[PDB]
Design a binder for this molecule. Sequence first.
Ligand SMILES: O=c1ccn([C@@H]2O[C@H](COP(=O)(O)OP(=O)(O)O)[C@@H](O)[C@H]2O)c(=O)[nH]1
Length: 462
Amino acid sequence: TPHVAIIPSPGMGHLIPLVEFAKRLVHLHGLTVTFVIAGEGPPSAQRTVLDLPSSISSVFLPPVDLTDLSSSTRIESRISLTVTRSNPELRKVFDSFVEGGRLPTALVVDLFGTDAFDVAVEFHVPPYIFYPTTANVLSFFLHLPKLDETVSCEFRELTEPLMLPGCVPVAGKDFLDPAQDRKDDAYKWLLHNTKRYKEAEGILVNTFFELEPNAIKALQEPGLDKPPVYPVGPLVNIGKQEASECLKWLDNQPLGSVLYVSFGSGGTLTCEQLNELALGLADSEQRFLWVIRSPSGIANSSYFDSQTDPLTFLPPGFLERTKKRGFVIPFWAPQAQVLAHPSTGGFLTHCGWNSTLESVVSGIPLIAWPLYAEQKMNAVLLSEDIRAALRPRAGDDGLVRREEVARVVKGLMEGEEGKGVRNKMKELKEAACRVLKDDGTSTKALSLVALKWKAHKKELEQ
Ligand SMILES: O=c1ccn([C@@H]2O[C@H](COP(=O)(O)OP(=O)(O)O)[C@@H](O)[C@H]2O)c(=O)[nH]1
């Protein structure tokens, strides 16, 4: 059977969907999978995630040396270089696969891991990309080499939004974070990765037709140097695994009553914003379950990570006033289970794509609160095109004040404002089931890829 090697770039939001993808490959397609894990140190959260059928093994590479990098290095530079600098160790793993008679049939990287294609090419292994965010942002990535060549200003200076075929228009000032400073190595690494996308034999994207129909149709049209694109989503943890205290609390709340609040694996708010969010959550008088992290002036400061107790940053009396109706859990919650719980009724999200897809699969409507990466692009898609998220108004200083927090929370949970988004999520919840049935469009697309891999292995071995 074909052996698929998967090399994630750092980040829980890369590993989680890749593990769901691997599980479908082994269970539904009979393939074998090895994760090759690059990094800086032992896995965190990560181990809970990698802890799987026998058909899935994990190899942890020796940690890469990133000690030459400035403390102010942006995350995408760190993420990309973790994979690039791991190539010599990845080659050693591939030599071990050759010796064991299990040369991979495919090497799957994620959106920042394209330098591992060097190893794939050396070993005559087809390179693929598993793209863990939207077809809209994939379109942006595929177009970036051309955009870079044709546009010479910082993107925030663009007066017209970018309107790629089938895509929601996005202002230059809202392009993903690593695109916002073209002089920084984060842009250099983003651009470099995008220029390698044309080398992929296929790109599997964690989205589905009904969610992004116009962008998927455009991506699948033949184009210059464009690989085949396969929507295979939503590949998520559906939340049926046994976790505890926050779920026990949830069990005691009415159907559809609780607002879950979470800023992904890496997100933090500023002090001032943390304060206004807490105050506005209390003011709203809604039930809530908030995964809290200590504040920072850097929005993705927890990406790789807490020492301090986040509860110490809450305002006077907040924990007291919300002792019954709010549950505040530091650092990490069993998010899949929360979103699948019948007592959950809404989600204030940073618009990371895994969180969005988990919410879609359970029909939970959103308040879009983007922080870093491509989240603002996702917020525009969710609120202006898909229409499954409400957005809070930030003042000219960037702060969402407590009055606005309370307004949008009540709008989502009880208001006329939230009816449209709740209905759209109901329809998307159905569609998410449709596309994953045996002859649903996402199952068909993944099956085409697995069939290609089975054919390739058959030809090689005969
Ligand atoms: O407290 C938390 C926060 C995050 N997650 C999971 O971590 C992933 C976060 O990925 P996402 O794409 O939403 O954002 P990122 O962390 O990459 O910014 C999702 O699968 C979440 O369910 C979780 O289980 N508990």
